[PDB]
Design an enzyme around this catalytic site. Structure first.
Site, PDB file in Angstrom:
ATOM      1  N   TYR B  98     -60.776  28.538  18.667  1.00 33.11           N
ATOM      2  CA  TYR B  98     -61.436  29.605  17.921  1.00 33.11           C
ATOM      3  C   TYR B  98     -60.406  30.383  17.121  1.00 33.11           C
ATOM      4  CZ  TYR B  98     -65.760  28.826  20.496  1.00 33.11           C
ATOM      5  OH  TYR B  98     -66.887  28.266  21.016  1.00 33.11           O
ATOM      6  N   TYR B 493     -73.023  30.603  18.019  1.00 30.82           N
ATOM      7  CA  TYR B 493     -72.893  31.819  18.827  1.00 30.82           C
ATOM      8  C   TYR B 493     -71.534  32.528  18.712  1.00 30.82           C
ATOM      9  CZ  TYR B 493     -70.063  30.918  23.157  1.00 30.82           C
ATOM     10  OH  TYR B 493     -69.031  30.709  24.059  1.00 30.82           O
TER      11      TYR B 493
HETATM   12  C1  FAD Z   1     -59.589  24.642  24.969  1.00 30.55           C
HETATM   13  C2  FAD Z   1     -60.693  25.088  25.910  1.00 30.55           C
HETATM   14  C3  FAD Z   1     -61.283  26.345  25.712  1.00 30.55           C
HETATM   15  C4  FAD Z   1     -62.462  26.755  26.359  1.00 30.55           C
HETATM   16  C5  FAD Z   1     -63.071  25.866  27.239  1.00 30.55           C
HETATM   17  C6  FAD Z   1     -62.506  24.601  27.453  1.00 30.55           C
HETATM   18  C7  FAD Z   1     -61.318  24.201  26.805  1.00 30.55           C
HETATM   19  C8  FAD Z   1     -60.566  23.010  27.352  1.00 30.55           C
HETATM   20  N1  FAD Z   1     -64.223  26.237  27.901  1.00 30.55           N
HETATM   21  C9  FAD Z   1     -64.742  27.503  27.741  1.00 30.55           C
HETATM   22  C10 FAD Z   1     -65.873  27.901  28.454  1.00 30.55           C
HETATM   23  O1  FAD Z   1     -66.132  27.367  29.529  1.00 30.55           O
HETATM   24  N2  FAD Z   1     -66.383  29.172  28.249  1.00 30.55           N
HETATM   25  C11 FAD Z   1     -65.780  30.053  27.368  1.00 30.55           C
HETATM   26  O2  FAD Z   1     -66.230  31.189  27.213  1.00 30.55           O
HETATM   27  N3  FAD Z   1     -64.658  29.644  26.676  1.00 30.55           N
HETATM   28  C12 FAD Z   1     -64.182  28.359  26.805  1.00 30.55           C
HETATM   29  N4  FAD Z   1     -63.029  28.015  26.142  1.00 30.55           N
HETATM   30  C13 FAD Z   1     -62.568  28.920  25.020  1.00 30.55           C
HETATM   31  C14 FAD Z   1     -61.422  29.877  25.392  1.00 30.55           C
HETATM   32  O3  FAD Z   1     -60.245  29.164  25.685  1.00 30.55           O
HETATM   33  C15 FAD Z   1     -61.766  30.819  26.546  1.00 30.55           C
HETATM   34  O4  FAD Z   1     -63.053  31.332  26.302  1.00 30.55           O
HETATM   35  C16 FAD Z   1     -60.757  31.965  26.754  1.00 30.55           C
HETATM   36  O5  FAD Z   1     -60.994  32.639  27.982  1.00 30.55           O
HETATM   37  C17 FAD Z   1     -60.766  32.979  25.615  1.00 30.55           C
HETATM   38  O6  FAD Z   1     -59.465  33.463  25.436  1.00 30.55           O
HETATM   39  P1  FAD Z   1     -59.000  34.910  25.952  1.00 30.55           P
HETATM   40  O7  FAD Z   1     -59.777  35.289  27.149  1.00 30.55           O
HETATM   41  O8  FAD Z   1     -57.497  34.858  26.289  1.00 30.55           O
HETATM   42  O9  FAD Z   1     -59.357  35.943  24.760  1.00 30.55           O
HETATM   43  P2  FAD Z   1     -58.310  36.460  23.644  1.00 30.55           P
HETATM   44  O10 FAD Z   1     -57.612  35.308  23.047  1.00 30.55           O
HETATM   45  O11 FAD Z   1     -57.405  37.568  24.191  1.00 30.55           O
HETATM   46  O12 FAD Z   1     -59.185  37.090  22.471  1.00 30.55           O
HETATM   47  C18 FAD Z   1     -60.478  36.613  22.184  1.00 30.55           C
HETATM   48  C19 FAD Z   1     -61.051  37.407  21.020  1.00 30.55           C
HETATM   49  O13 FAD Z   1     -61.639  38.587  21.533  1.00 30.55           O
HETATM   50  C20 FAD Z   1     -61.224  39.757  20.849  1.00 30.55           C
HETATM   51  N5  FAD Z   1     -60.506  40.662  21.781  1.00 30.55           N
HETATM   52  C21 FAD Z   1     -59.731  40.287  22.858  1.00 30.55           C
HETATM   53  N6  FAD Z   1     -59.244  41.398  23.452  1.00 30.55           N
HETATM   54  C22 FAD Z   1     -59.702  42.476  22.783  1.00 30.55           C
HETATM   55  C23 FAD Z   1     -59.515  43.836  22.971  1.00 30.55           C
HETATM   56  N7  FAD Z   1     -58.948  44.267  24.089  1.00 30.55           N
HETATM   57  N8  FAD Z   1     -60.129  44.731  22.108  1.00 30.55           N
HETATM   58  C24 FAD Z   1     -60.924  44.287  21.064  1.00 30.55           C
HETATM   59  N9  FAD Z   1     -61.103  42.925  20.881  1.00 30.55           N
HETATM   60  C25 FAD Z   1     -60.504  42.036  21.728  1.00 30.55           C
HETATM   61  C26 FAD Z   1     -60.328  39.295  19.706  1.00 30.55           C
HETATM   62  O14 FAD Z   1     -61.056  39.430  18.511  1.00 30.55           O
HETATM   63  C27 FAD Z   1     -60.018  37.827  19.984  1.00 30.55           C
HETATM   64  O15 FAD Z   1     -60.130  37.002  18.842  1.00 30.55           O
END
Ligand code: FAD
Ligand code: FAD
Ligand code: EUG
Ligand code: EUG
Lengths: 550, 550
Positions: B98, B493
């Protein structure tokens, strides 16, 4: 029509008539009334608060307006931005205990959305939802189901009465008593007219239906919805939906609500609890049953007086004018084969599973001394279990109305704090409430309704609306109880026109950061503050706080 | 550090230096890295997109900053306002497929919230909830529950992997696989730093914990919450939480997520579906069972190549360059003991009931010939089921990373439409996806994850990130699918940095009234436009649409 009793702020008589003659030309005179009577529940008023704690005419409309359809709402909105004119949108106006149809700001136009905007727009069996206009009552929607033999397939989830607006209730974040009792959490895909006049649809409602001959040329309002519109609330992006519940940010014209499949078996029950004190252990027991789903619905914990008041008014148990003593309450319990608290709930699904759960729930409650278990058939003709046996299966009813008539001109006003699902906290809270009703000359009446992790505690204040000394004591009661509950870590979930400001002022973490943020959004979308200024104590910038608050 | 690789729009070099001097002064030089490298999933890159569909350095940070505590967030925001300097807030940055941790607008300061803001703040047993900071992963919390003996009393809810942020994932409205799999819906009481710098808590987070001696003079950030804070999301008033999921309306600093009590019984299972077109009657069988709590959690329907990819790269099943034929998949099916589709589920609760449901479920899928039923024990030790036996009981793994290596320099990109819970619709979404995948020369890989009334269709595009020809083919595939699904009434979504604009342009009902209203709200709370410009296609007025859109 020429002369209302109250004009909206900063408005002239000439301007008012132009507006009204203007509005008439759109909606026809039969859908417009100027004001120059408390009504009933079966025929609600639209001009003021019928269960008034303030003067009868403290919240008073300048006029009522019934738009024929969505275009009219847009047409009206535009005139209100023209003339700078408070609107107050209702669906049904059965919000008694909370103001009813009354407009927070006097001189507002009451927009009776329910009269013509009326249609059960859809009932989709595979998707197991429906789509609904402001005026589709519970009862209405109930009837719609029977006229199409669908009652064999889909159940309703209803509040304690039949008449509320399905969607009206839903944006007030109200509560019924099947697994689908969190009403707000059952919506998906809503349509909204904004302060600016533009029509919006939420979530997957923003993905337009693909084009086809049959739907070409349809004004937005009348367009169908894409497949997932009423199936998945989230859509894509910032999830604004909640921005429209308990706020003054739009006028809701349609909503989709999820409906429960006939579960394949249903059984309700009444566990009675003998001592006042039994509240504590009862709630304690509830916690894991709820939290591990032995408890399928929103079950409720009822104070003896509520049930009793459904059975006969107060003069029917004692010609006392003062509150009922702790001893007479035992008498009345025993009189009606009821406990000092009473627990009502239900069981959904096949015989085999009901049994296991019901045994668990039977077992758990047996720890409370003197507990007695009753199915609907085990009670007198007139029982509350019988009434509720219909409620917990989505049948609309009206028996619960009578507890309003506890006193010669009974009016209800709800004080509605939330409570942990723990006995200790529940007792503390009840104690606070009970002490206070007492100081005010009032019988304490209330349910706790059971959230997964919280409990809505509805102190049902009934008072005599022709008694000035009492009204005042009610106004002292409510205000006091708010502060007390806040001094002990408890806000209220929903209130009355007269209490909106104070209540919000209770949610003042970090120097009122929540309200401020709310004001910003409110002025942004509503440049001329014409939509429901003052709801939930959120005021557009042209409404001086000093002038408008309570 | 002095001279960065990309500067944020409209900013002079001089300005970047006085800016990052100020941030080095507040946070110390070890919480600031200036960029002048792809890594992997376990040491996640904070600068860019590790699974790049565009150029590697397309979406790129100017600097990364790691705030130590909340008040650094307030100071970094005040400064970004002072300089007009966009920020990209991340929690852990494992949003691979993403965009990972890449800013939508190149030149941003990536805000590494998770490096130091790290604490499991609370675990509440009787309330059955936790509060969490951005830096707590799924694994983090799981080790917190084990070292406090809590695995006994409370279960987590995990996506496919364990590195993800509990809070990060939740604000993405992401999805896991127990009855608590709707992560966002399980939230209550969140902390936010607004764009103007002010701290806000939502719901009953706005109800202040009553004064007591031990909490006096505590900076607002460090303060306790009142008791209902994390038990009832709604509080009073407009329900603003959802403005902070998939939005740029603020930086989230704290979130409460509900935890499911140990059920007292557990058992996963796999149902194998022989034929490709068996998806159709499967979904049809799942429909009434999902809607009726025989299927309590979020079960998944996996494509045969999804499991095949977990056990070995593509080079190990075929030496073909073109995508695999129908017959060679039937071959890989009979090989692994799997079907063409594979349904993974779980029953939760005490045995008496598990028993009954499971007989209903077995008995319902038996209308498909050649069906086969497996418990975790009945399978190979390296099986996917044994991996999911853990995922659907709150235990994280890392095993599922293996499928990313279906092709040489593996990278994933998710195409995530939503479908009806009807085999017809699901086939149709599949056939529409399958057609374009072939055109692009890619194998189709996917799962449907079963929501109550909806199915998240995760089309798992894998591609060689070091193949210029194919990455272009993937961009083409993505942009075409979006369009094809739209013309078919389906929206996505959630998505990637390079496709946010397109997807939002997809939700254009009534001339983009959804985006427009969103834009209005954004410009209101973020005057200078610094929090995450471009997220979800919501651009502040200072970002030209012509200049920035894709
Ligand atoms: C490669 C992969 C990924 C994956 C998956 C299976 C594989 C092998 N299966 C998933 C699933 O079962 N369900 C799901 O929801 N995601 C799945 N993924 C995708 C992804 O790897 C995971 O969802 C992962 O947990 C998301 O990454 P993370 O939790 O580390 O989130 P982030 O990178 O920090 O940021 C995500 C977005 O959210 C907004 N954000 C994050 N923090 C803030 C704060 N504190 N304040 C405001 N906005 C925030 C950002 O916009 C960011 O882009
Ligand atoms: C008297 C009483 C009340 C009651 C109850 C038992 C008794 C005997 N039991 C209740 C219960 O079971 N659960 C519950 O949630 N409420 C209960 N009440 C209170 C009341 O009777 C019902 O809640 C009733 O449903 C509320 O009335 P109604 O549904 O008719 O709503 P309304 O009067 O039309 O208006 C409520 C507010 O909603 C907002 N609103 C309504 N329409 C719009 C439009 N479309 N656009 C924007 N906002 C809208 C307004 O703020 C309005 O004032
Ligand atoms: C009596 C029950 C009741 C009354 C008013 C309400 O708002 C409510 O919902 C929480 C329940
Ligand atoms: C593979 C699983 C998956 C990947 C990305 C997502 O967004 C998702 O949401 C349910 C699931």
């Amino acid at each position: 029509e020429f002369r209302p009793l109250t004009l909206p702020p900063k408005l002239s008589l000439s301007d008012f008539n132009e507006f009204i003659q203007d509005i008439i030309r759109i909606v026809g005179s039969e859908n417009v009334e100027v004001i120059s009577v408390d009504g009933s529940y079966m025929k609600p008023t639209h001009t003021h608060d019928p269960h008034h704690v303030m003067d009868q005419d403290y919240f008073l409309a300048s006029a009522i307006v019934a738009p024929r359809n969505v275009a009219d709402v847009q047409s009206i909105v535009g005139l209100a931005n023209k003339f700078s004119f408070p609107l107050w949108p209702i669906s049904i106006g059965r919000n008694s205990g909370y103001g009813g149809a009354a407009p927070r700001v006097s001189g507002s136009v009451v927009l009776d959305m329910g009269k013509n905007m009326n249609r059960v727009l859809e009932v989709n069996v595979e998707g197991a939802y429906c789509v609904v206009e402001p005026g589709v009552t519970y009862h209405d929607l109930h009837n719609y189901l029977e006229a199409n033999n669908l009652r064999d397939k889909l159940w309703l989830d209803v509040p304690d009465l039949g008449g509320g607006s399905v969607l009206g209730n839903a944006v007030e974040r109200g509560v019924g008593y099947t697994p689908y009792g969190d009403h707000w959490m059952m919506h998906s895909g809503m349509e909204v007219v904004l302060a600016n006049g533009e029509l919006l649809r939420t979530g997957m409602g923003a993905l337009p239906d693909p084009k086809r001959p049959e739907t070409m040329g349809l004004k937005p309002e009348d367009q169908p919805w894409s497949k997932i519109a009423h199936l998945f609330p989230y859509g894509f992006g910032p999830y604004i939906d909640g921005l429209f519940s308990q706020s003054n940010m739009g006028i809701v014209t349609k909503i989709g609500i999820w409906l429960m499949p006939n579960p394949r078996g249903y059984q309700s029950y009444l566990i009675t609890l003998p001592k006042d004190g039994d509240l504590k252990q009862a709630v304690d027991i509830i916690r894991p049953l709820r939290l591990g789903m032995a408890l399928q619905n929103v079950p409720t914990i009822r104070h003896i007086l509520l049930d009793a008041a459904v059975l006969g008014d107060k003069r029917s148990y004692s010609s006392r004018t003062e509150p009922l003593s702790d001893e007479e309450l035992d008498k009345i319990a025993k009189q009606l084969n009821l406990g000092r608290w009473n627990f009502y709930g239900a069981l959904y699904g096949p015989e085999p599973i009901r049994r296991v759960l019901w045994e668990t729930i039977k077992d758990a409650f047996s720890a409370i001394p003197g507990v007695k278990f009753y199915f609907p058939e085990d009670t007198p003709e007139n029982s509350v279990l019988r009434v509720r046996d219909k409620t917990m299966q989505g049948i609309p009813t009206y028996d619960e109305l009578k507890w309003i008539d506890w006193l010669p001109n009974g009016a209800h006003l709800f004080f509605s704090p939330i409570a942990k699902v723990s006995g200790e906290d529940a007792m503390m809270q009840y104690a606070v409430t009970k002490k206070r009703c007492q100081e005010a000359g009032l019988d304490y009446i209330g349910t706790f309704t059971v959230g997964m992790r919280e409990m809505h505690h509805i102190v049902c204040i009934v008072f005599n609306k022709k008694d000035l000394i009492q009204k005042r004591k009610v106004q002292w009661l409510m205000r006091t109880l708010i502060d007390d509950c806040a001094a002990n870590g408890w806000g209220e979930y929903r209130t009355h026109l007269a209490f909106m400001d104070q209540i919000m002022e209770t949610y003042n973490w970090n120097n009122s950061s929540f309200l401020r943020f709310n004001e910003v959004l409110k002025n942004a979308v509503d440049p001329n503050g014409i939509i429901a200024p003052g709801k939930s104590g959120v005021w557009p910038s042209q409404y001086s706080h000093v002038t408008w608050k309570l």
